[PDB]
Every structure is written in structure tokens, then in C-alpha cells.
């Protein structure tokens, strides 16, 4: 079972900064 | 146990999902600088 | 000890899952594709 | 006769190919075939379908 | 007179199947089908 | 070319939904098929479907509509109905389970689940749309699927198209009888997601829709079906110049800096004046002066809130009908002198005006009657922060004695997420009052 | 002169033919019967109004042809051509290659020169076949051998079954498919792949139809065998040769495996709703998802991509929509390959099969990419081939029956290769 949820917890880190990246087009019209 | 090992193997079936995403997105990000700086060379 | 995981969106289509996400009928769209959003 | 007749079957045919108002036409007159073989498509797949509900119904007899 | 026999031969068949923009200025379907019913 | 895209969420979304496509389709000639009438095939003279309506080669116009839901036992009746067809059929998106009336299954537990699916199905829409003039978010604050999923698609869409206009409609609860126990602990915190992920949300109660059906349509037995009607109207009465032309005519861009002066007062009453049954139509007289006057009138409202002890802050009038601007300018200006109507100091103007050529349409079994002329009253009044003021206190009441809180910890909710919720909250209520405060 | 002629061999290989000739047929207008009521191509001309098929349909065992000729289309197919044995290769390469092929190796030969001869310009050959039993393996390979010298250099074209990731009808699967390659490897000349998970998925996602069988999915690999060689059949605009398929497809020697994914697979209740444009419909063969191979594009490099497009496509947004393709950076195109883009306007619109699964399109395509992630695919099958053969596992047969222990391992360094070489194409 231990490693099961072990891995969540680096899923929910790498599910959270995906939700951090698009926090962080325009280049072909105007530009 | 054969059950949970099974659960156990969509969940990095799912992890290289996470880092595929995150692969394609630095590609689609770094790129975009290049792409600035390739039209930035024409506009300057 | 068979059993197939039930999908939650009612469709035919559209096996979706709790932990597989991202399988579903990729889209319509006429500018760009499905992977370049 | 046979150079009057070649005359106006392929100058009708200049003005088929060249003129983008009938191609514009053209191309929807076969999407107008589209629907009515997509009704008969439409049609069949519950024609079909109703071949073996009566075979479900007698194996199960 | 290419618009209409074309309209002719490949329209009398599909009658509920039609497109939209087809039968431009009404008087089209006046020297067509008897009830048509557009 | 100007077009937009309206988004549906749970079954208080489909309702209308069902509701005012009816009236869409009805509107020029659409047919519960897609099929547009063949006394309207000739020629093609017609661009006034392509803001609601796709349209594919064939004939067929598909509408810029997904339905998502958690509860699959409201969108079957439309995949059985009379508009079975009309609907793109993997545009309607249904799960297994509902969202048990509680946030935190509609935006942790499962709503993650089904969120990149339904992206999907907007950048469906936004790939056709050539130029989206806006959304229009449909959902109410009752519980888990009206509440939890729009908040995440809030969060989600504001980062996927960023600079955009998008409008937003949402019943709101009681301020004496509701129909949800657990209700008030959703509206502080889906607010939270609201004041800064969405451009404008419009105030509408279904409790005045009662009442409005007592005074006004002189009707027993007001149901759901014609309370979402008048709703289904007022859609249209906001979006009519998107289809046709006018005199003023006004685009959704127009409306986002027209209204609200600040980034987090996006609050404002919708509220219809010409709503009158078919028998009391006969006898009243109609005209653009004296309908203006019934826009005001406390009875004649949208949320349970008198505006008497309100400030009128923003406002803007969209008129359908044979409408003159002259006897417009002559009505306005009789508001402007009437004393109990009061202001703010800081906007000696005040109105915006809108019109449109086009008379209402009727649908067919409907209460409302064939009116000449219509007018759409859209005002942002200081007097709604009672509303919260009479909610905020039912939320600490609850939460005084931490109720009803187990079962949203339990599905992966933060306890301390509620505090700063409340905490930005009563900024709101500080802001209400430093806005309405005359100048010195 | 434009002329073909295939050789399905292999239960699933003739299955698939089965299938092709039904729209092959309906395609020109062939009844069933074979009499008529533009197609050298496939179709042969006789006495009476009688265009008989141009292949040679084979299976070392029984069943399947006996049903074949008497059953549906019985008439058509020439008894000769039909080519049946006695007995199953019981997917043993051995038996397939050094065995029990040798049987029939001239049978099918000899009847192979007699269509060749009649023929004057075959464009190509079109050995469909499945790696996964000894037909559709051995005998295969001892097929495509052999005619390497009685046919000379020409289109050796074959659109086969590559065993699927977690689906696998057969235990000995790896020996047979990583057996077979060495020998096509270099007597191939395009290995147009495409597998079974991902053609009940698409036929599934796209077309809604759960517990799928194999005929659906036959008529699928169709409209795919269809569209490669529309071209030569009926007439269009830009128009592409078995020949030149070759010199845009298959940059390196070696590497000549690419892909396939036609592209409107709609049913007909959804058609209704959405519509289909050379845009949308280009915008969605690059799609991950599409794809007829489990082997999903993203997690590699397209080297090349020819973009069929039997319809009535215009021959401007096509370019317009291959531009956008283009700049998108997620499709990621190898700095070898600047331009990466064969095209291929058909005017004739795709048939609707009688009774079959898709909506008839105006517009549809079929793009065989071939992408660097094909090389993923042939590791985790050459993964269960390392496991089976430490443990020498079924080599009991196979080896002793009429083969060698030294091909076992020759394979191996082989097929290491190819996929080495696959990797050194990306760099
Ligand atoms: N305007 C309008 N509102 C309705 C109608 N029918 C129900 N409602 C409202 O819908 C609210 C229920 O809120 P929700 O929690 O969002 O119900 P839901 O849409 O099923 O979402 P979940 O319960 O979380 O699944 C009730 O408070 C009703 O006031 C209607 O026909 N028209
Ligand atoms: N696409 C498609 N694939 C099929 C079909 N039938 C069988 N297959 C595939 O082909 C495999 C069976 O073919 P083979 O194992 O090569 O059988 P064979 O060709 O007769 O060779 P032997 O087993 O030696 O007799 C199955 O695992 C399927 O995946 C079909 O109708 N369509
Ligand atoms: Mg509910
Ligand atoms: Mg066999």
C-alpha cells in the first residue's frame, strides 16, 4: 500500500504546478 | 494484492502522462521566446 | 477476479475514469489540432 | 451535324469547369445526395438492428 | 441555362435532402415540381 | 460578424436551457429538427442565426450549447424530447452519480474528473467562433454541480482565454424560504471564485418569479417551467442587437464598461418591465413612457431587495420594438426628476440606452402576451449588499456551531479556506459602504 | 497499364482481403456475380462482361477459402487464384517458412506469374498479411523472398497486423513477429502498420460501437487500402503512384515502416450534427488518438507525413491547413525532413459500404506518417521476445521442425539494429 499514495502525493505535486504553469495568439495577428 | 498491484500500475500509467504534458509544455513555452526573439531579429 | 472499471460520463463513447482522464472522442476544430491548444 | 453537336456539349463544358458560382452549386448538390444516403444509412441501421431482435427473441423461445 | 439544367437533373429526386442556398429568386421552383412545397 | 457561446451547468442550467432554446429556435425560424423552414431556403437571406447557431453544409444548424452535468437524470428528457436532434449528441455531457448537493464533491471529489473534458468541448466552440463576442455561464448556487463545477470552469476558462468578456447567470437563494439546508454555505465561498474569474453576474431570484406570476401574470400555480421563461426572455432581451440591427445597437464588449466601476462590484438586477398576462394586456395602454416607469417600481423587481434604501449606481436600458428615441429621451428624463429615485454623486449620467427593431416573440402555451414593444431594465443597485448582509448572517449563524461541515472535510475540503472566504466577504460588505459614501 | 496485385495470406490477411474486394467492387460497380450491370486497376477483364479480381488469395490450411468461395461473392474470385493447403502452420515460422510453405511456394508462384503476365505495367505488389501465425509468417517472408528475384525491383508494398500492446490473441506472438521482420527488413519496401487495440478504440471513440468483432475493424483497414491506391484508380487533382508513396515516405533505406489513421471515421447520427472540412479533418489525423497504432506520435518525431485526400477537397485550404499544422510546435517535425508534407487530392468522394460502420464524407484523408515512435512499439514486443527466448519457451517446435537456433539469435542483433537505427534518425 505504501507505495501507492507515495505516488500520489508526487501526483497531486505534478497535478498542481500543471495548474501553476498555465497561470504563468497576439504573436501572429498583431505581431 | 493482485488487484492493488493492478491500481498501482494505472497510477504511473498516469505519471508518464503527467510528464509527457509537462515535456510538451517547456517545448511549447521555450519555444515561444524563440519564436519572439525569431520575429524580434525581423522587427528590429 | 474480473471486473472492468465503470466509466462516469453515460456515454457509449467516452470511457472516462477517476485516474484516466484525458480518454474521451478527441475534437472538432478547424484552426488547430487536438494537441496544440 | 456532328461539328455543331461537339460545338455546344464542350463550351457548356468551358463554362462548367471555369465558373465559381456552379462549382459552389455543384458541391451542394452532392451534400444534398449526403443526406439522402445518410437517411438510407439512417434507415438501414435500424432495419438492421431489427434482424436479430427477432433471433434474440427465438433462441430465447 | 447551365444552372438550370442542372437544377433539372439533380435536384427533382432530392426534395426534403435540399440545401440552403440553391433556389435563389423565387420564380425557380415555378418551372419545377407541380406541388414542391419549397 | 458578431457571435457568442452559452454554457449550461447542472440541471438548474438545463432548465432554462430547455427553456430558451425553445425561444432561440423559435426566434427566426429554427425547427425542433435543426432544419430551417424551406420558405426560408430561398436564397439564403438570413445572418441573424450564425450568433447562437452553427450551421453545416447540409442544413442543419447546430447551436453553440454544451450541457454538463453531474446529474444524468434531467438531460435524458432532452435526449427524449422534442429536441432530441437539435443538440450536438457529445455536446451533452452527463455523469454517473449527481454531486450530492455539496461543494466539495462538485469541485475536488469529482468535478476534476470531468473538467478537461468539457475545455475540450469549449474549444470546440471557440475553434468555429471567429470572433467570440463572449460566454454566457447558466448555473445557480444550490449545491455541488451549480455551484462546485462552474467555480472550477471559472478558474479554468479565465486562463485559457485571459482578456475576454463573459456573462454569467445564476439564481440566487432566499431571503425567508428556501429549498436547500446546506444552500448558504455555498454562496459565500462560490462568490470567492466569482468576484475575480468572471466579468459581470447578473442578480436573479425565483422567488420575485412567484410573485411576479401573483401581481403581474395573474396565475395560480406558478411552476418551474414559466418561471424559467421569463428568464429565457431576458437572455434574449440582452442579446437581441448581438442578431439584429438597431438604432443603439450594443455588442456583449459594449456591456463589461458600461456597468461596473470597479473589478469586484460585477453584481448587477436584471430585471423585464412588460411582463403582463394576455387578458390585462388588452386594457393598458403600452407605450415607452410609462413601461420605463414600471421598470423602477420595487414590485415589478428581480431580487428581493427594495431599492428605495439603495443607491443607483450604473445602470443601462435595452429596448426591442417599434421604439422612437425621442419619447426614450422624453421618459428618462422624467426619472432623473423624480426625487425617490436616488443617485450617486460620482455618475451625473447614469443610463445607457439600446435599441432594437425587432418586437418580442411569443411562444406558443406561454403566459406571456404579444406585446408591441419591450424593455430590458439592468441596474447595479448598492441596496443588493442587504442581500449578502441577510445571507452573510445565516452563513455565521451555521457557522457559529460548525453544521453540516463533515461532509464537505471528508471530501477533501480545507476548513481555513471558509475563514478567508468569509474574511473577503467582509471586505465586500466594507466596500458596498465605501463606494455609496458621498464624496467630502 | 496503372495495374495491382496483392496476395493476402493469413486467416486475418485473407479475412482482410474479404472485406477490400467488397468495397473494390462496389468502388467501379462489379455485382458480387463479377459482371458489370477505369478499374484494371484490380478488376480483369474477360469473354461476357465478366471483370474477375487480380490477387491470389492464400492460407496454408483449409476453412476460411472454403467459405470464401462458397459463400457471398462466390462466383468472382477464380478457382484457381484461391490457393488453399491441407494443414495450419500452427503459428510456427518454421512451419510456415521451412516446412509446410515449400508446398505451396510455387503453387502460389506460378499462379502469381500467370495475373503478373496478363497485367502490362503492374505499378506494385500488396502482400497483406498478420504477423502472428505461420501462414502469416513464414510462409509470408518465404513469399516475399522468393518473388524479391521472380518479379524484379518493384512497388513490394504489404499493409500488415503488427501485434498490439496489452491485446494479444496468441502466446508465441513475439517469436513469429520478431522472426518475421529480418527477412522484410530488406525485402520490403513500405510496411504500412496498423494494429488491433487501437482499430477497436477508434471504432469505439469515433464511431461508438463497444464489443467490437474483426469484421468491423476489415472495413476499416480497407477504406486505408483504399485511399493508398484511389490515386492510380479513379482520376483527381495532385495525384501520387505507388512509386512515389516510396521516395515521401521512406527517408532512409532501413527505416521503412510508417503508419496509417484515415480521418472523417464518423457514424452517421453523429455526421448530422458536425460537419467536416480539409481543415478539421487534417487538424485531426495528428491527433494521438486517431492513430491506427498504439504507438502515439507525440512521444517521438514525424520524419515524413503523405496526406491522402480522396474527396472533394479544394487545392488551396488543404496547403492553408498543412501551414498551421506546421507551426504548432507540439507535432514535432525532424530538423532533416525542412519541408515533410506530401499531398494528394482525389475527386472521388469514399463509398459507403452496404451494411457496414461508417458515414459516407464528402471529404476524408489518410495521413501514413512515419514517426520515430514506431521504434517504442517494436522494443515492448522485442521485450516480450527477450523474456520468452532466455527461457528458450516454445523453442522446443519451432527451432526443431526445420529451422535453426541461429536465426533466433540473428533476429535479435537484427531487429537491435533496426531499432538503433531508428534512434540515430532523430538526433
Ligand atoms: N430558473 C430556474 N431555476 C430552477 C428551475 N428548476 C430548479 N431550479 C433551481 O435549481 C436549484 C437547485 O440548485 P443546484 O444545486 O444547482 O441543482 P443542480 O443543477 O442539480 O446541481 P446539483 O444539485 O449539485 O447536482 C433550486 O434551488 C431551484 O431553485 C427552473 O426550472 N428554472
Ligand atoms: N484487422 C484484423 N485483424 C485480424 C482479423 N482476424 C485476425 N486478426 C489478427 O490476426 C491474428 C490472427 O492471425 P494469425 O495469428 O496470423 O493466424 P494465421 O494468419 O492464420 O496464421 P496461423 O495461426 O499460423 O494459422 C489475431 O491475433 C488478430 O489480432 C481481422 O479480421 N481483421
Ligand atoms: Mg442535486
Ligand atoms: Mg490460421
Same mark, same amino acid.
Request: glycine fraction near 6%.
Given at each position: 500500500?505504501?507505495?501507492?499514495?507515495?505516488?500520489?502525493?508526487?501526483?497531486?505535486?505534478?497535478?498542481?504546478?500543471?495548474?501553476?504553469?498555465?497561470?504563468?495568439?497576439?504573436?501572429?495577428?498583431?505581431? | 494484492?493482485?488487484?492493488?498491484?493492478?491500481?498501482?500500475?494505472?497510477?504511473?500509467?498516469?505519471? +508518464?502522462?503527467?510528464?509527457?504534458?509537462?515535456?510538451?509544455? +517547456?517545448?511549447?513555452?521555450?519555444?515561444?521566446?524563440?519564436?519572439?526573439? +525569431?520575429?524580434?531579429?525581423?522587427?528590429? | 477476479?474480473?471486473?472492468?472499471?465503470?466509466?462516469?460520463?453515460?456515454?457509449?463513447?467516452?470511457?472516462?475514469?477517476?485516474?484516466?482522464?484525458?480518454?474521451?472522442?478527441?475534437?472538432?476544430?478547424?484552426?488547430?489540432?487536438?494537441?496544440?491548444? | 451535324?456532328?461539328?455543331?453537336?461537339?460545338?455546344?456539349?464542350?463550351?457548356? $463544358? $468551358?463554362?462548367? *469547369?471555369?465558373?465559381?458560382?456552379?462549382?459552389?452549386? *455543384?458541391?451542394?448538390?452532392?451534400?444534398?445526395?449526403?443526406?439522402? *444516403?445518410?437517411?438510407?444509412?439512417? @434507415?438501414?441501421?435500424? @432495419?438492421?438492428?431489427?434482424? $436479430?431482435?427477432?433471433?434474440?427473441?427465438?433462441?430465447?423461445? | 441555362?447551365?444552372?438550370?439544367?442542372?437544377?433539372?437533373?439533380?435536384?427533382?429526386?432530392?426534395?426534403?435532402?435540399?440545401?440552403?442556398?440553391? %433556389?435563389?429568386?423565387?420564380?425557380?421552383?415555378?418551372?419545377?415540381?407541380?406541388? %414542391?412545397?419549397? | 460578424?458578431?457571435?457568442?457561446?452559452?454554457?449550461?451547468?447542472?440541471?438548474?442550467?438545463?432548465?432554462?436551457?430547455?427553456?430558451?432554446?425553445?425561444?432561440?429556435?423559435?426566434?427566426?425560424?429554427?425547427?425542433?429538427?435543426?432544419?430551417?423552414?424551406?420558405?426560408?431556403?430561398?436564397?439564403?437571406?438570413?445572418?441573424?442565426?450564425?450568433?447562437?447557431?452553427?450551421?453545416?453544409?447540409?442544413?442543419?444548424?447546430?447551436?453553440?450549447?454544451?450541457?454538463?452535468?453531474?446529474?444524468?437524470? =434531467?438531460?435524458?428528457?432532452?435526449?427524449?424530447?422534442?429536441?432530441?436532434?437539435? #443538440?450536438?449528441?457529445?455536446?451533452?455531457?452527463?455523469?454517473?452519480?449527481?454531486?450530492?448537493?455539496?461543494?466539495?464533491?462538485?469541485?475536488?471529489?469529482?468535478?476534476?474528473?470531468?473538467?478537461?473534458?468539457?475545455?475540450? &468541448?469549449?474549444?470546440?466552440?471557440?475553434?468555429?467562433?471567429?470572433?467570440?463576442?463572449?460566454?454566457?455561464?447558466?448555473?445557480?448556487?444550490?449545491?455541488?454541480?451549480?455551484?462546485?463545477?462552474?467555480?472550477?470552469?471559472?478558474?479554468?476558462?479565465?486562463?485559457?482565454?485571459?482578456? /475576454?468578456? /463573459?456573462?454569467?447567470?445564476?439564481?440566487?437563494?432566499?431571503?425567508?424560504?428556501?429549498? !436547500?439546508?446546506?444552500?448558504?454555505?455555498?454562496?459565500?465561498?462560490?462568490?470567492?471564485?466569482?468576484?475575480?474569474?468572471?466579468?459581470? !453576474?447578473?442578480?436573479?431570484?425565483?422567488?420575485?418569479?412567484?410573485?411576479?406570476?401573483?401581481?403581474?401574470?395573474?396565475?395560480? &400555480?406558478?411552476?418551474?417551467?414559466?418561471?424559467? &421563461?421569463?428568464?429565457?426572455?431576458?437572455?434574449?432581451?440582452?442579446?437581441?442587437?448581438?442578431?439584429?440591427?438597431?438604432?443603439?445597437?450594443?455588442?456583449?464588449?459594449?456591456?463589461?464598461?458600461?456597468?461596473?466601476?470597479?473589478?469586484?462590484?460585477?453584481?448587477?438586477?436584471?430585471?423585464?418591465?412588460?411582463?403582463?398576462?394576455?387578458?390585462?394586456?388588452?386594457?393598458?395602454?403600452?407605450?415607452?413612457?410609462?413601461?420605463?416607469?414600471?421598470?423602477?417600481?420595487?414590485?415589478?423587481?428581480?431580487?428581493?431587495?427594495?431599492?428605495?434604501?439603495?443607491?443607483?449606481?450604473?445602470?443601462?436600458?435595452?429596448?426591442?420594438?417599434?421604439?422612437?428615441?425621442?419619447?426614450?429621451?422624453?421618459?428618462?428624463?422624467?426619472?432623473?426628476?423624480?426625487?425617490?429615485?436616488?443617485?450617486?454623486?460620482?455618475?451625473?449620467?447614469?443610463?445607457?440606452?439600446?435599441?432594437?427593431?425587432?418586437?418580442?416573440? =411569443?411562444?406558443?402555451?406561454?403566459?406571456?402576451?404579444?406585446?408591441?414593444?419591450?424593455?430590458?431594465?439592468?441596474?447595479?443597485?448598492?441596496?443588493?449588499?442587504?442581500?449578502?448582509?441577510?445571507?452573510?448572517?445565516?452563513?455565521?449563524?451555521?457557522?457559529?456551531?460548525?453544521? #453540516?461541515?463533515?461532509?464537505?472535510?471528508?471530501?477533501?475540503?480545507?476548513?481555513?479556506?471558509?475563514?478567508?472566504?468569509?474574511?473577503?466577504? !467582509?471586505?465586500?460588505?466594507?466596500?458596498?459602504?465605501?463606494?455609496?459614501?458621498?464624496?467630502?
Amino acid at each position: 500500500q505504501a507505495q501507492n499514495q507515495a505516488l500520489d502525493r508526487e501526483i497531486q505535486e505534478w497535478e498542481s504546478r500543471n495548474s501553476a504553469h498555465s497561470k504563468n495568439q497576439h504573436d501572429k495577428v498583431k505581431s | 494484492l493482485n488487484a492493488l498491484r493492478h491500481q498501482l500500475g494505472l497510477r504511473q500509467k498516469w505519471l +508518464e502522462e503527467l510528464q509527457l504534458q509537462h515535456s510538451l509544455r +517547456e517545448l511549447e513555452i521555450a519555444e515561444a521566446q524563440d519564436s519572439n526573439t +525569431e520575429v524580434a531579429k525581423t522587427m528590429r | 477476479n474480473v471486473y472492468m472499471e465503470k466509466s462516469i460520463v453515460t456515454g457509449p463513447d467516452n470511457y472516462i475514469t477517476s485516474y484516466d482522464r484525458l480518454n474521451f472522442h478527441p475534437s472538432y476544430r478547424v484552426c488547430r489540432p487536438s494537441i496544440c491548444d | 451535324l456532328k461539328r455543331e453537336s461537339l460545338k455546344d456539349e464542350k463550351l457548356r $463544358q $468551358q463554362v462548367r *469547369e471555369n465558373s465559381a458560382e456552379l462549382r459552389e452549386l *455543384e458541391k451542394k448538390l452532392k451534400a444534398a445526395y449526403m443526406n439522402k *444516403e445518410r437517411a438510407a444509412q439512417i @434507415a438501414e441501421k435500424d @432495419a438492421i438492428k431489427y434482424g $436479430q431482435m427477432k433471433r434474440d427473441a427465438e433462441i430465447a423461445r | 441555362e447551365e444552372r438550370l439544367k442542372l437544377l433539372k437533373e439533380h435536384a427533382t429526386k432530392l426534395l426534403g435532402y435540399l440545401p440552403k442556398g440553391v %433556389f435563389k429568386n423565387e420564380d425557380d421552383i415555378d418551372m419545377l415540381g407541380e406541388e %414542391f412545397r419549397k | 460578424m458578431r457571435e457568442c457561446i452559452s454554457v449550461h451547468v447542472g440541471q438548474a442550467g438545463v432548465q432554462i436551457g430547455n427553456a430558451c432554446w425553445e425561444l432561440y429556435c423559435l426566434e427566426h425560424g429554427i425547427q425542433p429538427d435543426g432544419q430551417m423552414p424551406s420558405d426560408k431556403t430561398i436564397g439564403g437571406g438570413d445572418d441573424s442565426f450564425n450568433t447562437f447557431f452553427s450551421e453545416t453544409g447540409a442544413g442543419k444548424h447546430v447551436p453553440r450549447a454544451v450541457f454538463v452535468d453531474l446529474e444524468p437524470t =434531467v438531460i435524458d428528457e432532452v435526449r427524449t424530447g422534442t429536441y432530441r436532434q437539435l #443538440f450536438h449528441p457529445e455536446q451533452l455531457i452527463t455523469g454517473k452519480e449527481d454531486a450530492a448537493n455539496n461543494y466539495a464533491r462538485g469541485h475536488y471529489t469529482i468535478g476534476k474528473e470531468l473538467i478537461d473534458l468539457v475545455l475540450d &468541448r469549449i474549444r470546440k466552440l471557440a475553434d468555429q467562433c471567429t470572433g467570440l463576442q463572449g460566454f454566457l455561464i447558466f448555473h445557480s448556487f444550490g449545491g455541488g454541480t451549480g455551484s462546485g463545477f462552474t467555480s472550477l470552469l471559472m478558474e479554468r476558462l479565465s486562463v485559457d482565454y485571459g482578456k /475576454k468578456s /463573459k456573462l454569467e447567470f445564476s439564481i440566487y437563494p432566499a431571503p425567508q424560504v428556501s429549498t !436547500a439546508v446546506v444552500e448558504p454555505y455555498n454562496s459565500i465561498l462560490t462568490t470567492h471564485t466569482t468576484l475575480e474569474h468572471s466579468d459581470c !453576474a447578473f442578480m436573479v431570484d425565483n422567488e420575485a418569479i412567484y410573485d411576479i406570476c401573483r401581481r403581474n401574470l395573474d396565475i395560480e &400555480r406558478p411552476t418551474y417551467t414559466n418561471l424559467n &421563461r421569463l428568464i429565457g426572455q431576458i437572455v434574449s432581451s440582452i442579446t437581441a442587437s448581438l442578431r439584429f440591427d438597431g438604432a443603439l445597437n450594443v455588442d456583449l464588449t459594449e456591456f463589461q464598461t458600461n456597468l461596473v466601476p470597479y473589478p469586484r462590484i460585477h453584481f448587477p438586477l436584471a430585471t423585464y418591465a412588460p411582463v403582463i398576462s394576455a387578458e390585462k394586456a388588452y386594457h393598458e395602454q403600452l407605450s415607452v413612457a410609462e413601461i420605463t416607469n414600471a421598470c423602477f417600481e420595487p414590485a415589478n423587481q428581480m431580487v428581493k431587495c427594495d431599492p428605495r434604501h439603495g443607491k443607483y449606481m450604473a445602470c443601462c436600458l435595452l429596448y426591442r420594438g417599434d421604439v422612437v428615441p425621442k419619447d426614450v429621451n422624453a421618459a428618462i428624463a422624467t426619472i432623473k426628476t423624480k426625487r425617490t429615485i436616488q443617485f450617486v454623486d460620482w455618475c451625473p449620467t447614469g443610463f445607457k440606452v439600446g435599441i432594437n427593431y425587432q418586437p418580442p416573440t =411569443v411562444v406558443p402555451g406561454g403566459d406571456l402576451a404579444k406585446v408591441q414593444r419591450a424593455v430590458c431594465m439592468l441596474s447595479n443597485t448598492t441596496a443588493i449588499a442587504e442581500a449578502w448582509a441577510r445571507l452573510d448572517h445565516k452563513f455565521d449563524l451555521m457557522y457559529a456551531k460548525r453544521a #453540516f461541515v463533515h461532509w464537505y472535510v471528508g471530501e477533501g475540503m480545507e476548513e481555513g479556506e471558509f475563514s478567508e472566504a468569509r474574511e473577503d466577504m !467582509a471586505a465586500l460588505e466594507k466596500d458596498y459602504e465605501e463606494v455609496g459614501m458621498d464624496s467630502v
